[PDB]
Symmetry: D2
Subunit: 410 residues, 4 copies
């Protein structure tokens, strides 16, 4: 027997030669993108073959073997329906149905405190999925850039804990939700910020990363880190958003001097420079598609699912998911964890970074926020997703009533 | 083919007839107890047969089938290592190690609030495990009865949500932790108690169960419900503990009058009668073993693992586990959620009810409490357990660093 | 020389004999009532002579001498304009003017929680004045009984401090206002009630008076005090108000149990008996006239102005006025202290006990309350009164701009 | 009759002529100082005559009249013992006794967060009195300059209310104590600072004064105002303290940005410039003597007692005294109002501005603070003062037990 050959028979279906487009179509229906970085060798060999043998686009067993051999393990997992969601085409038709239903929730107000979020349409709406195996689906406006805003807070906390360790980080920042109306206090009773998901805690965490290097390199270093998280998909930067947040962030300067006074930063911190860095991190741009891969790295124990790259330690990913669970959705965190039961993080640009641990990462984006700061269409979507599927942190994988389990077959 | 007979060969082990103790010994090592309620028919058949032939008590092929036929599906899974923890004997060896290391943490103070919890010794320490498949293990004082105290709160919340539904129950009680800076208030700003896991919230939940029938019938009904939850293992009642709670609950009467004044009860509530019921519910008695089965029902979507009976709705089991996650360990809940990442609920007699969703339920019991009200030995055990195994709610099942995964074979 | 003689000449106006009605009229215009207890002997002899000498009604010097001889010292201050408010007839004309302007403020809502406070009319409005010299004036419904409610709180604190001393009393009760965003906590950070003017503070103070005797004698003992303070004018009791206060005090029972749990009462306290005592003290009845004398006793360093009797120690009167100043008007205390600057205490029956130190005491009563619990017409009157006269705690006696100073002549 | 003559005889005591030193001694014992601004003409006339007749410096009726005639009403009130405290020398003898007992209270910590308060001694201690009539007494270190710090807060509040009115001022700042469980929030529920006596409230009040003018002119105007309040006694400015407060007011910059975000300032406010102004106001220097005169203006309805000038509206002085009562001694405010019952304001340099309305103004100064920020010797002194004299706001002037009433004979 031979593994390149058994797959050949699986697809050849008693026929002699495989039309190459027939191979591509079977590949895509698994959820894999033909541009998947782990498939470069296979696609490079196929494109070359349609040059070298420009008569009739047929693969025999000998030719099939040489094209798929380098990436054979992944292709068998895809074709032997071993991915986390085996019937991916079924699942995405549900995602599309939830997407369309959320689309009808036309309420909410686009954040307009700087002229740059004001220029976004209320009608922009996109959802992107990347599973722990790299299966991809997008619907709506998933290639429109927008800033991460507070959706960067879990990412940079994950980075700090990865590089510095649990102990160090949490000498400077707490690990609990504050209390449904301690939203106005910057510090807990230990004179630490409550958690990394509130502005004061993120500001403290911004001040822990890559100490002793200047702001240009600190930024470069985080960007390089986010690029790996996103499997090298779009990660960008809005200088415009940066200028407007720095010229209008009185509240963040208030946090900054308060934290300095109460000595909350590591020694030798230049607070106002740290505030500058913080404004930059919030103006990093993503798309729905690229950001979904970042959340999938967090769903996948810190390995980027579309590259196989270890990005973050398991410790960083667990802490981040733990604090996204209780602290990630502003004053709605407690209601969200109860009804949705998934780690998620919202930002004022209307994004929600969603993690279904061991299954998939998602980014939903609709700019209109509700009175709590959370995107109306996104929130509506994340209730539906958990109401349809047994993805709630405390659903049971064996007894789950009328809910759907996309990880399973029949 | 025949499943009773291919099973016979796996155990007969090329030989002709099976000595019955060889079958019993093999059975026990899967984790199953000979007393498993789902095995009665088979055990009844052995009881008949080992009566008939006290010489040549060995089971031939025909006779083995005759005893095992009725429970063959369950015996096949046990013997083909299909249970959630396949190598259960190794697992209990780690449980026994965690037990001994917790056993040496001699700190803490026995609650000295009543003469009935005061009469318990600091040296009592017990841990009991029941998986979602009914596999059982105990070490220490796992058959010593003790009162549930606040470990009854998730159970009575479970029943209430089971009988009335999420929406109704939460007209009366919130669903978030208050904040370690609002542990002293009885009501949130919506004038409901913060969650069901605190005294004010539990008192409100007591008032929703079986309204309009008297308290004698309500107690019977809760006991019958707890009986299904523990698969009819030990559930009792301490009148002594009840009397001492009834003369020592000034704080509970303060709560009761405050809730009545603010109209927090359903109409037709007799507040002073509800407090009496509440004091009884806190004096329901369990062992580590029976209570471990109660937790396993919560690990298993509301189906009792040693009987197969559907006891609680999934909605009931999900809400309860969500609120044990953030509110179950007094002021230590936020730290416990971060570091342990399991639903747990502690009580003042030294019990900690632990749920590992889709894996197991446990009860740890040591009366000596720490300064926050939590069992010292219990708390220490629950750290080691998650430090050893990837049972943390947000550990990754694929990349998990140095931890052990008992669900795996190799 | 002789005082009976020059006083005789003062009234005689060069004439030989004084018509007795002329003496009565001059006396009344000073503010004194002919029924003033300090004038009994003089009035007894005048009435006696209008019997013995139905030939008259003229008084020559010797007969005037024998009637006034007993009360001559006070009659001289009355007639030589030595009282705190010399031109008393002018002053009452201004009181009447303020009464009428307050009379037109028809807003507010009568207290409606028990059947006995609901039954008081919005049209009742009365103001009664008693200076520190016994000068009296009334306007409106000043002889209608009503319950003191929280206006008894300063009185019983005064008794407490009088009998036990500042240090002892304030081991159990604080001396500060809670903070306008702390109306809902029963205890300050030292686990004492904030001050004696809140319900929990009054409940603690009720428990300090005449410890170890039963409730019947404790009550009599306090009533006996209120009689002396009111110069033996009407002090009564509403059993009806008492019964409904005890059937509607869920919150007060909530306070009592909370206070017992936190060990806030003196040892040997029967908390539930103390609550009944407190409900009794709140149903003590006065009129505006008798209660104005109680306030005048507080304006007078603890001496009753219409009897000359020492009732309360100065230390007791000072502490009380300090806490009526900052804590006396529910959530309006800080605004009232800023804009009115007078010691005052409001109650839910529509009373406001007002003290102008060294000048007079007052009682205003109009049942309609405002959203903070304070009598609407009462509040309006005390603003106008201090806008008219330099009575504000921190007005100046030399420079006072547009204001009138009734202590002055021309 | 003649007013200069009846006074001349009371002082002459039936004798020929009054020796000039004998008239001066009688003056000093009333409490008045020979430098009292309201006595300048009489003193100017005395210095003129002390040249003409440089030998036997006796004043006869005719010559005495020539010196006192211009200031006769005030000299008559002083010599007929019509002042608020008639036996002032008795009263000051008690002040000295309270001073010495407080001096033995050696505890507390000199504030050291800026090097300019660090450089002060723990043993500095002075008390100064100026009555509503200009009677003066000092004991201790009453001519040593020190910064006002938060004891300026009521003064600049008084100015704002004087110039802009109660309504306007309190559109921006509350009028209540927060509650000993709110000293850490900058804003009350209406998103105003709780009162003008806390830092966030004073920072806002700084922003109301003399708007639209630059900081140089704003400071000048407050100084000119303070000069009137203190009857032109010592008022200065410490540049050093200013530099250290501006380089270390991270908490104050935190307050400023928070207030800016919640839009608590009047339109067109330059916040960072307002903070600079605020640091300046807190580095104004006084002595116990000059500052005691400022407090006497507040005890006297806004009239400066040693000049007769109307300085503050009555509305300004009452509001100020009301909030000094409840908000003036940091977390000790509620305790101070209960046991002392006088408007007072303390600052971190160890000063306490004390007002007994209608009686006197006072300044106590000892740098060592207690754990709440209040001067230890000052706090001890004002407890003793009210334990001895019926000065508590809610003492009775008629029935006051064993206490002293310096207003009576
Ligand atoms: C919206 C809201 O706040 N609702 C409430 N729920 N419960 C409340 N107070 C109960 C009753 C009185 N208790 C307390 N008094 N004092 C305290 N604090 C301290 C330092 O002693 S706690 C406990 S208010
Ligand atoms: C109505 C209202 O809420 N008004 C407010 N005013 N000011 C606020 N917050 C400022 C800025 C953040 N500060 C604080 N953080 N943490 C604290 N307490 C502790 C124990 O750490 S105080 C102070 S909220």
């Amino acid at each position: 027997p031979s593994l390149e050959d058994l797959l050949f028979y699986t697809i050849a279906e008693g026929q002699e030669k495989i039309p190459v487009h027939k191979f591509i179509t079977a590949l895509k229906s698994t959820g894999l993108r033909t541009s998947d970085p782990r498939l470069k060798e296979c696609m490079d060999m196929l494109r070359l073959t349609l040059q070298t043998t420009s008569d009739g686009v047929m693969l025999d067993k000998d030719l099939f073997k040489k094209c798929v051999q380098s990436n054979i393990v992944l292709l068998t997992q895809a074709f032997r329906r071993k991915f986390v969601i085996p019937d991916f085409m079924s699942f995405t038709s549900h995602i599309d149905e939830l997407y369309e239903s959320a689309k009808k929730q036309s309420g909410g107000k686009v954040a307009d405190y700087i002229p740059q979020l004001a220029k976004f349409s209320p009608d922009l709406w996109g959802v992107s999925v990347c599973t722990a195996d790299g299966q991809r689906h997008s619907t709506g406006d998933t290639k429109v850039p927008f800033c991460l805003q507070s959706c960067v807070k879990p990412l940079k906390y994950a980075i700090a804990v990865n590089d510095l360790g649990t102990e160090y980080v949490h000498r400077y920042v707490g690990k609990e939700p504050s209390g449904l109306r301690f939203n106005k206090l910057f510090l807990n009773e230990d004179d630490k910020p409550h958690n990394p998901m509130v502005n004061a805690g993120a500001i403290v965490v911004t001040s822990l990363i890559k100490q002793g290097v200047n702001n240009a390199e600190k930024f470069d270093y985080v960007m390089q880190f986010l690029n790996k998280m996103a499997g090298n998909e779009y990660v960008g930067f809005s200088n415009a958003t940066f200028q407007s947040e720095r010229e209008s962030g009185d509240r963040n300067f208030a946090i900054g001097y308060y934290l300095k006074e109460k000595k909350c930063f590591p020694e030798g911190t230049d607070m106002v420079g740290i505030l500058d860095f913080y404004f930059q991190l919030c103006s990093i741009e993503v798309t729905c598609e690229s950001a979904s891969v970042m959340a999938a790295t967090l769903a996948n124990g810190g390995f980027c699912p579309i590259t196989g790259e270890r990005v973050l330690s398991p410790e960083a990913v667990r802490n981040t998911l733990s604090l996204m669970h209780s602290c990630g959705m502003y004053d709605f965190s407690g209601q969200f964890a109860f009804h949705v039961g998934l780690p998620a993080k919202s930002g004022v640009a209307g994004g929600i970074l969603l993690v279904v641990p061991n299954v998939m990462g998602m980014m939903c984006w609709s700019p209109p926020l509700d009175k709590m700061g959370n995107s109306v269409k996104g929130i509506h979507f994340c209730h539906d997703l958990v109401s349809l599927c047994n993805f709630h942190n405390y659903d049971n994988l064996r007894h789950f009533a009328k809910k759907l389990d996309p990880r399973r077959e029949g």
